[PDB]
Amino acid sequence: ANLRTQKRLAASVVGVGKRKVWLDPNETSEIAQANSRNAIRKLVKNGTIVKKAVTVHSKSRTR
Amino acid sequence: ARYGATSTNPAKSASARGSYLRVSFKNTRETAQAINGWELTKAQKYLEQVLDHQRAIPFRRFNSSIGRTAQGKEFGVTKARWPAKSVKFVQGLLQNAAANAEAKGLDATKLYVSHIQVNQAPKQRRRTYRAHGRINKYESSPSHIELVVTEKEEAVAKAAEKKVVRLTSRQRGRIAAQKRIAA
Amino acid sequence: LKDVVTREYTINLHKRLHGVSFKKRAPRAVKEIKKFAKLHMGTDDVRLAPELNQAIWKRGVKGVEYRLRLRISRKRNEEEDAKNPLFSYVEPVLVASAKGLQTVVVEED
RNA sequence: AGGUCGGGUCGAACGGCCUCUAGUGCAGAUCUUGGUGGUAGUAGCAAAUAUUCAAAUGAGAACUUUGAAGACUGAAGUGGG
Ligand SMILES: [Mg+2]
Ligand SMILES: [Mg+2]
Ligand SMILES: [Mg+2]
Ligand SMILES: [Mg+2]
Ligand SMILES: [Mg+2]
Ligand SMILES: [Mg+2]
Ligand SMILES: [Mg+2]
Ligand SMILES: [Mg+2]
Ligand SMILES: [Mg+2]
Ligand SMILES: [Mg+2]
Ligand SMILES: [Mg+2]
Ligand SMILES: [Mg+2]
């Protein structure tokens, strides 16, 4: 499928960039059915679409 | 309809064609001439080997400044290539002609490609942008391909003309004298 | 026909990537692993695990390891009959060091 | 100079002779318009560090999507307006 619009909606809904969204490759059919921001919010709530963690920039060496 | 110049039995023949195929005419001509006159299954197997780079299509006419290769040794040539797109189109047409032949009710094992010809389709043109603000052409040379596969028949005929003879009186006398002088 | 066998080998990638351009070392390592599996198992359909891809690309392009322990399992092919009835699958073998080990056939249980 | 017949193709008008008339005969003019070649499957498609693996879709995937990995722009950014 083509989940570009799903990733864009998920980024705009969660509030992070597209680099931090995780669309699981097993629920591709349900993500493809998800065509609205409400359905994207449901997928985020039940954990199909996950917000990845921040890549750390540790300040220990400079401290 | 109205194929090229063929000399075969249409009752023992099947045909296929493809017009306005966006494939290079110079490569399809060599791909056709490589299999012209071949048995059908042998030609198909050879085309799959060409696609898998085990054998090559010899380039006879449109071959200037192409590279040399060892796989031309089969054909006594030094210049050969692997025109994959032309092989795809040609083997698709071969499959269509085999389907037409088995629909006609032909033997399907005596089938050899008797006729196959390629000629130039109308060009499909684009533009090229060259230095100092010039425009040139960037055109594809597509192909009309057609082929006729026929059943391999037996010996053609015998019993040539009567060959009427005209002999002078002197020649007749010589023949009669020899027939008298011998037994 | 027979020979669904699975083994563990050690590929010396150093002598295979000697002289290769730095930005092609890891893709050439992938291609040489495919060629190695074709040499040993005779199979042209070689599938590498993404874990093996990570083990190759763990140190960038030009940081490919010298020796790599591989598990190659020649499997019976499936899926809408293809060209070949056999396909090879290459897993990485987690180990401390890939040095000193010889190839061993592993039992399937 | 040209004319005539036969064969093939084609489908709707055309010729001989006596005269009249002219926008009346092409190989050229770096001629005009249009078309087509050899060159030639040739020159080439090489700036901007870099891509790889699996799965899905599909007739078909180096290039599409997802995931993973590796990278880059490096806030006088390849970002946001
Ligand atoms: Mg030359
Ligand atoms: Mg050259
Ligand atoms: Mg240009
Ligand atoms: Mg300009
Ligand atoms: Mg060197
Ligand atoms: Mg009419
Ligand atoms: Mg005039
Ligand atoms: Mg002229
Ligand atoms: Mg003149
Ligand atoms: Mg001129
Ligand atoms: Mg070239
Ligand atoms: Mg250049």
Curated annotation (Swiss-Prot), chain A:
* Natural source organism: Saccharomyces cerevisiae (strain ATCC 204508 / S288c)
Record-listed Phosphoserine modification sites: S29, S36
- State the function annotated in the UniProt record: Component of the ribosome, a large ribonucleoprotein complex responsible for the synthesis of proteins in the cell. The small ribosomal subunit (SSU) binds messenger RNAs (mRNAs) and translates the encoded message by selecting cognate aminoacyl-transfer RNA (tRNA) molecules. The large subunit (LSU) contains the ribosomal catalytic site termed the peptidyl transferase center (PTC), which catalyzes the formation of peptide bonds, thereby polymerizing the amino acids delivered by tRNAs into a polypeptide chain.
**Lineage of the species this protein comes from:** Eukaryota, Fungi, Dikarya, Ascomycota, Saccharomycotina
Residues of the whole record sequence present: 2 to 64 of 189
Q: What is this protein called?
A: Large ribosomal subunit protein eL19A
Composition skew (Basic residues), residue ranges: 58-63
The UniProt record's further free-text remark is: Present with 97700 molecules/cell in log phase SD medium. There are 2 genes for eL19 in yeast.
Binding partners and assembly: Component of the large ribosomal subunit (LSU). Mature yeast ribosomes consist of a small (40S) and a large (60S) subunit. The 40S small subunit contains 1 molecule of ribosomal RNA (18S rRNA) and 33 different proteins (encoded by 57 genes). The large 60S subunit contains 3 rRNA molecules (25S, 5.8S and 5S rRNA) and 46 different proteins (encoded by 81 genes). eL19 lies in close proximity to the binding site for eukaryotic initiation factor eIF4G.
Q: What family classification does the UniProt entry report for this protein? A: Belongs to the eukaryotic ribosomal protein eL19 family.
- Please state where this protein is localized: Cytoplasm
Q: Where is this cross-link: Glycyl lysine isopeptide (Lys-Gly) (interchain with G-Cter in ubiquitin)?
A: K20, K52, K59
From Swiss-Prot, chain B:
Q: Name one GO biological process term.
A: cytoplasmic translation
Q: A GO CC term?
A: cytoplasm
Positions bearing the Glycyl lysine isopeptide (Lys-Gly) (interchain with G-Cter in ubiquitin) cross-link? K45
Disulfide bridge map: none
In the UniProt entry for this protein, what further remark is given in the free-text comments? There are 2 genes for uL22 in yeast.
| Subunit structure, as described in the record | Component of the large ribosomal subunit (LSU). Mature yeast ribosomes consist of a small (40S) and a large (60S) subunit. The 40S small subunit contains 1 molecule of ribosomal RNA (18S rRNA) and 33 different proteins (encoded by 57 genes). The large 60S subunit contains 3 rRNA molecules (25S, 5.8S and 5S rRNA) and 46 different proteins (encoded by 81 genes). uL22 is associated with the polypeptide exit tunnel.
Q: What is this protein called?
A: Large ribosomal subunit protein uL22A
Supply the gene name: RPL17A
Curated annotation (Swiss-Prot), chain C:
- Oligomeric and partner information: Component of the large ribosomal subunit (LSU). Mature yeast ribosomes consist of a small (40S) and a large (60S) subunit. The 40S small subunit contains 1 molecule of ribosomal RNA (18S rRNA) and 33 different proteins (encoded by 57 genes). The large 60S subunit contains 3 rRNA molecules (25S, 5.8S and 5S rRNA) and 46 different proteins (encoded by 81 genes).
Tell me the function of this protein: Component of the ribosome, a large ribonucleoprotein complex responsible for the synthesis of proteins in the cell. The small ribosomal subunit (SSU) binds messenger RNAs (mRNAs) and translates the encoded message by selecting cognate aminoacyl-transfer RNA (tRNA) molecules. The large subunit (LSU) contains the ribosomal catalytic site termed the peptidyl transferase center (PTC), which catalyzes the formation of peptide bonds, thereby polymerizing the amino acids delivered by tRNAs into a polypeptide chain.
Is the Signal keyword given for this protein? no
Sorted UniProt keywords:
Cytoplasm, Ribonucleoprotein, Ribosomal protein
Where is it chiefly localized? cytoplasm
Q: Which GO terms describe its molecular function?
A: structural constituent of ribosome
Miscellaneous note, as given in the UniProt record, is:
There are 2 genes for eL31 in yeast.
Q: Some GO term, biological process aspect, for this entry: which one?
A: regulation of translational fidelity
Checking PANTHER family in the record gives:
60S RIBOSOMAL PROTEIN L31
Residues passing through the membrane, by range: none
UniProt lists the family membership as follows: Belongs to the eukaryotic ribosomal protein eL31 family.
Source domain of life? Eukaryota
Cited Pfam families? Ribosomal_L31e
Q: Where in the cell is it found?
A: Cytoplasm
Question: GO CC annotation: what is one?
Answer: cytosolic large ribosomal subunit
Q: Which CDD domains match?
A: Ribosomal_L31e (cd00463)
- Return the protein name: Large ribosomal subunit protein eL31A
